[model samples]
Target: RDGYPLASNGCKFGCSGLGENNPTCNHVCEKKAGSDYGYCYAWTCYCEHVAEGTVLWGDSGTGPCRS
Candidate 1:
């Protein structure tokens, strides 16, 4: 994916979520910052390819970014 084996600390969310791709969500990671934003950094990742299970948006489901 991005020279990170499609994951960092084992993650594919950055490539998937930001790119508008499908991020697998068996259930929410519930790791606060981990699955909260649908993106993974250095600390949030856990799996071989740290990917967020779900993306937390506002009540309108329009993401946290409003227009």
Candidate 2:
């Protein structure tokens, strides 16, 4: 929860990997059709799906990309 609650396009609120003990922004990522999938943050590595009700930080866990 450090350096987060970001403001973008009138939106606010918001991670990473390597067990930094912080949550990555992977939850904010979106892959466009026919376009390369981009990670919102560096720690937010590409993950297929995160488990439900799991508390994933930037450090590790099922990668925040999935719900």
Candidate 3:
């Protein structure tokens, strides 16, 4: 919990429907860019610091990762 807070604009399933192509994301992801293998489903994230100084992953005021 001593580290400074860190966060960034993330990406999510910007496109819907199966086998969708030419999609968009907050972050860049191109399959043709050599080993990119972009994500089909994505979301934002934030640092999670506990009382015991444990570094964890948490959502930004959201329910859970899969909510």
Candidate 4:
């Protein structure tokens, strides 16, 4: 899918205890942010294709809004 490819750095949990490929953060990025896919790396999560209005929903912030 086509997307902006951004980092979910604002994640509340930051994929800490959520395991390597955080299902919690992943599902949130996919559903909440409308990303094609999501993955976790270290204490951060990355998402692709930044959503429209949902890009800055506090805990769900992605892309440039993330950092």
Candidate 5:
């Protein structure tokens, strides 16, 4: 399975590693794939099997690619 919810087409919505005393995308990746494989790619983040529920943005609203 693809890295859904966390990764938009295998990339993250929030790529920020540093936290402002808040929940960062990096934390999301760590919670699933552990701290070792946590990193950002492009404008999004990538983590393996990080399924925080089946909730994810659909392909219909994928900005440039869809339109």
Candidate 6:
């Protein structure tokens, strides 16, 4: 199912969701110490069925993406 809020599900808000594979937009990740998945957006962290590893930033946790 398309990722949308329950309040916006039954409307024409055209809500976009967050994810690594989201083509419509990008993610703003935060860093945390001693976390398995150190990066998160919508309060969702850690992988379940997906790959189990640390969520890194630009260069695999080195820093932000370079232009």
Question: How displaced is residue 8 in candidate 3, in Å?
Answer: 13
- Residue 8, model 3: lDDT of 22
TM-score of each candidate? 0.17, 0.20, 0.20, 0.40, 0.40, 0.15
- Model 2 lowest lDDT segment of ten: 5-14
Off by over 4 Å in 3: 1-11, 18-22, 25-27, 30-35, 41-67
Task: Kindly report which residue pairs in candidate 6 clash with one another.
Answer: none
Comparison by TM-score, 2 against 4, better one? 4
Q: What is the per-residue lDDT of model 6 for residues 1-67, given as tens digits with 9 covering 90 to 100?
A: 1222222112211112332332111122222222222223332322221222322222221111111
List the lowest-lDDT window of 10 residues for candidate 3: 25-34
Q: Write the per-residue lDDT of candidate 3 for residues 1-67, one digit (tens) a residue.
A: 3212322233122333322342432122231122234333433222212212433233222222233
Give one digit per residue, the lDDT tens place, for model 5 in 23-58.
255555565545445445344444555544544442
Tens-digit per-residue lDDT, 1-67, candidate 1: 1122332232423222323323332133333333333444432222222233333332111222222
Give the winner by lDDT.
4
**Candidate 3: pairs in clash:** none
- Lowest lDDT 10-mer window, candidate 6? 6-15
5, model 5: CA deviation in Å? 9.3
lDDT of 3: 0.28
**Top-down lDDT ranking:** 4, 5, 2, 1, 3, 6
Q: Give the number of colliding residue pairs in candidate 1.
A: 7
Better model by lDDT, 2 or 4? Answer: 4
Candidate 4 regions exceeding 4 Å error are 1-13, 17-23, 51-53, 56-67
Q: What does candidate 2's lDDT look like per residue over 1-67, in tens digits?
A: 2223222222221233333443333333322112223334543343322322223343333334223
